[PDB]
Amino acid sequence: IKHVPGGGSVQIVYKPVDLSKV
Amino acid sequence: IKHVPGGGSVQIVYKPVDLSKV
Amino acid sequence: IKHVPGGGSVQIVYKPVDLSKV
Amino acid sequence: IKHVPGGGSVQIVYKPVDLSKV
Amino acid sequence: IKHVPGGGSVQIVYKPVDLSKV
Amino acid sequence: IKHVPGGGSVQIVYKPVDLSKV
């Protein structure tokens, strides 16, 4: 019995710029 | 019995700039 | 920006019995 | 931007019995 | 920016019994 | 019995700049 969700994962975000207004 | 969620994960964010206004 | 691998994950094992021989 | 691999994932095993020989 | 691997995860094992022999 | 959430994790943020206004 094993449970192994989301293993070995990568995310990359390159040069993001945020100009949001609130 | 094992539970091994999210193992080995990477995140990269490269040169982010935040100019947000509140 | 979020990364959430294996997030919110569940395992349930109910009344397991082990009689293994080695 | 979200990344959520294996998110919300479930396993259930009910009354397992192990009789393995080694 | 957040990274949250395995976040919010649960395991339950209910009334396990071990009679293993070596 | 093991529970092993989020093991082996890396995060990298490279040369971030924060100019946020409140």
Numbering used by the authors:
A (entry chain C), B (entry chain A), C (entry chain B), D (entry chain D), E (entry chain E), F (entry chain F): 297 to 318
Question: What do the authors of the reporting publication say about this deposited model?
Answer:
The assembly of tau into amyloid filaments is associated with more than twenty neurodegenerative diseases, collectively termed tauopathies. Here, we describe twelve phosphomimetic, serine/threonine to aspartate, mutations in tau, which we termed PAD12, that collectively induce the *in vitro* assembly of full-length tau into filaments with the same structure as that of paired helical filaments extracted from the brains of individuals with Alzheimer’s disease. The tau sequence ([Fig fig1]) comprises an amino-terminal projection domain (residues 1-150), a proline-rich region (residues 151-243), four microtubule-binding repeats (R1-R4; residues 244-368) and a carboxy-terminal domain (residues 369-441). The tau folds of AD and CTE comprise residues from R3 and R4 and the carboxy-terminal domain.
Solution-state nuclear magnetic resonance spectroscopy suggests that phosphomimetic mutations in the carboxy-terminal domain of tau may facilitate filament formation by disrupting an intramolecular interaction between two IVYK motifs. Finally, line shape analysis revealed that residues 297-319 of wildtype tau297-441 displayed reduced peak intensities compared to tau297–391 and PAD12 tau297–441 (**[Fig fig6]**). Residues 392-404 of wildtype tau297-441 also showed similar attenuated peak intensities compared to PAD12 tau297-441. In addition, it could be that the reduced peak intensities for residues 297-319 and 392-404 stem from conformational exchange broadening as a result of a transient intramolecular interaction between their respective IVYK motifs in repeat 3 (residues 308-311) and in the carboxy-terminal region (residues 392-395). Such an interaction, which may resemble that between the two protofilaments of the FIA, could inhibit filament formation in the absence of phosphomimetic mutations. A similar interaction, which was also impeded by phosphomimetic mutations in the carboxy-terminal domain (S396E and S404E), has been hypothesised to occur between the microtubule-binding repeat region of tau and its carboxy-terminal domain based on FRET measurements.
